[PDB]
Symmetry: C3
Subunit: 276 residues, 3 copies
């Protein structure tokens, strides 16, 4: 909405002049991935504040397991009051840098009763509840330099990468298996009532969270390959008996507990991404 | 952003610039590009020449019925507020129109639907409406209608019956069901398609519901239909994807059929 | 959000300087509660127009001896108010020292067991505007009000619903107190048959156009919440019917229930924790 094509190009040109790094892969770090940047070789850090036209967090360029990457440490959320054209601005910039693959991670509440806290859910699909009612990051004039006016989302989550994620996990010899299912985005920031949890379950959602879907829609619009996963930080309360309530402290704690596992998994998975 | 006087000024400008007095407004969806080509005594106004208009408005006779056709409609996905999207409907009321015919393209959710099927809209599901994107949001003007209008009778029962009889007197049956509006402009995921099916929607599209709500608010009779341009993808196996090119192509293929159907249907609209 | 913390504080300080009344309970009067203020002792009236930063009247006094402030007239999303205007009074109530919110409304019946005139205790809600971004907490969080990510699963105080059921029983009323899930939709137009079938399948017992925003802001600031719906009409759920939902029937059901609702709320004040 408030960005011109030239604004995206200006940001891209600034980054390309300020780093020799040329990323193939953008990684939008969700809950548990705070310290993924700590595994980079030839790390180069830009605070969002230094970068022209960035919403008012760090961008880190380097090699993860020898793959050229740019990592978003801190992401923008609808609940913070950012319009979706600010939330998704970095994805357009990543395209103009030459990125062809987006890895997106988040925290989610478990709606699938088979899910346990600490489970990693590969995102096979999403339900965009804000999108239905008008909150789609593509709303407004389309620029054909980014992509088509009416892009398909039915193939948003790369089938090959989900297969390679399953095989990678198996070779790490981890105690618990990978989950796979549907992420529903809600705006938040307040957690769901029992009645709302039952709604999202009946809609066929496996996990609920407050991000990711906008970035994926913009990535697919630009032609990026997309892979995503949720850390299941908590089981959403689905009955009136329970005196447990969802809280941010338990989300942070589950993230901290999973951090080493998630970092290792993403690092190893870089080897499985197709070459440019 | 419009005052009552803005609507009135637009209506007065049109009434002074044409001798035509339409009874029927037709909002042309996918496939109806060339419906204006069937008008007698055709008179064209580019949106740009019309005061307060956010494309062309064409006045004339379709099968001898006094009509005004919207060629080009405004969509939520284009970034228009719903008070711009639905502005023409208020104007139509002030011109003396008593009937709105609304057409669109839609994706098939009902597995019985085939590409090229015409679905009479019996009802709608307003997903943007639930969350606040209702064109009536804001102060109500009683000169247009009631603060809290009913929508349960939005799609005129008589016109749906006469549409079925007209169709019979023209290879495939006329479908009938529920249209769900989503904002778009991206097409639905498989999971989203399963949601709209479980909500009981037969067809999905990206328009129409706003105009219908404003039309019913103003007391217009409403008739609508969808051209089923594509079957929405409902399983992960398929390598088929929804695309705008297929929507345009289905529209072009159905155009002669849709134009003939609407033209003949004019004869079935009640007199004022 | 167009209000700063200092704006809420300025409004609260103005009211605290202009009345000696110190309410424990805020009552947001829905359909049928027009005349509840007429039962207050030591009543003191402020027109919204007089009150700094207010987007109707605020009445302070004692209801059955309980210190209360009553909103007569509430702001609705369908009027064009942003939710940060709709819910502004709730923040003010917190700063006045209110610890309990009583919220009332009119609703359409989705549950086929419900009859017109039934009172439904709200056990839970479904926030349809909230899912899509219309949450009154959207924007920067102020920790002086509450947490960035508050839970809503315990929004409707269990104890007050138990005491409401026992209070009802002691009034010896013809019909039982209903209980269930309120779904907020923005309106202002009434639902289609297909939309009524959606809300039923989502598990909603009753539909209306308010309340959920106020509750979310109340819970964010740590208020105890009790709420109920007057069932003004049974929503049309089949194509055969020539009945339509209309505002006149909503007003008429409100008028018919008014004496019953006023008595119920008055008696219930005695059951609120100190
Ligand atoms: O139960 C749940 N309901 C709804 N959302 C959630 C989330 S996500 C979440 C919650 C609080 C703060 C931040 C969060 O995510 C940030 P991000 O990873 O998308 O960057 C966990 N649990 C539930
Ligand atoms: O599968 C589908 N999902 C969601 N919407 C659709 C539409 S409508 C449509 C699609 C692309 C561009 C424009 C469109 O409509 C314009 P209008 O007819 O309302 O003026 C067809 N098929 C699907
Ligand atoms: O069938 C119904 N559908 C949807 N909403 C309703 C309501 S609430 C309502 C209706 C018309 C006008 C105002 C109303 O609310 C005022 P408040 O009590 O929230 O302040 C009753 N019946 C139905």
């Amino acid at each position: 909405n408030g960005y011109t094509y030239e604004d995206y190009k200006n940001t891209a040109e600034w980054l390309l002049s300020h780093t020799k790094h040329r990323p193939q892969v953008a990684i939008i770090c969700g809950s548990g991935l705070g310290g993924l940047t700590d595994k980079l070789t030839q790390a180069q850090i830009f605070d969002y504040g230094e970068i022209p036209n960035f919403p008012r967090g760090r961008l880190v360029f380097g090699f993860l397991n020898g793959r050229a990457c740019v990592m978003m440490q801190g992401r923008f959320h609808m609940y913070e009051g950012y319009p979706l054209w600010k939330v998704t601005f970095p994805v357009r910039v990543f395209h103009l840098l030459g990125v062809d693959t987006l890895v997106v991670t988040n925290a989610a509440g478990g709606l699938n009763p088979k899910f346990e806290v600490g489970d990693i859910m590969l995102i096979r699909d999403h339900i965009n509840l804000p999108g239905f009612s008008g909150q789609n990051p593509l709303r407004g004039p389309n620029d054909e330099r980014f992509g088509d006016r009416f892009p398909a989302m039915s193939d948003a989550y790369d089938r090959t990468m989900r297969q390679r994620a399953l095989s990678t996990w198996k070779q790490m010899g981890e105690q618990r298996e990978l989950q796979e299912g549907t992420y529903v985005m809600v705006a938040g920031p307040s957690f769901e009532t029992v009645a709302e949890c039952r709604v999202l379950q009946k809609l066929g959602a496996d996990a609920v969270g407050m991000s990711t879907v906008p970035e994926v829609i913009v990535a697919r619009h630009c032609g990026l390959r997309v892979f995503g996963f949720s850390l299941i930080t908590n089981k959403v309360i689905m009955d009136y008996e329970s005196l447990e309530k969802a809280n941010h402290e338990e989300v942070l704690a589950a993230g901290k507990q999973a951090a080493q596992k998630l970092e290792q998994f993403v690092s190893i998975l870089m080897a499985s991404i197709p070459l440019p």
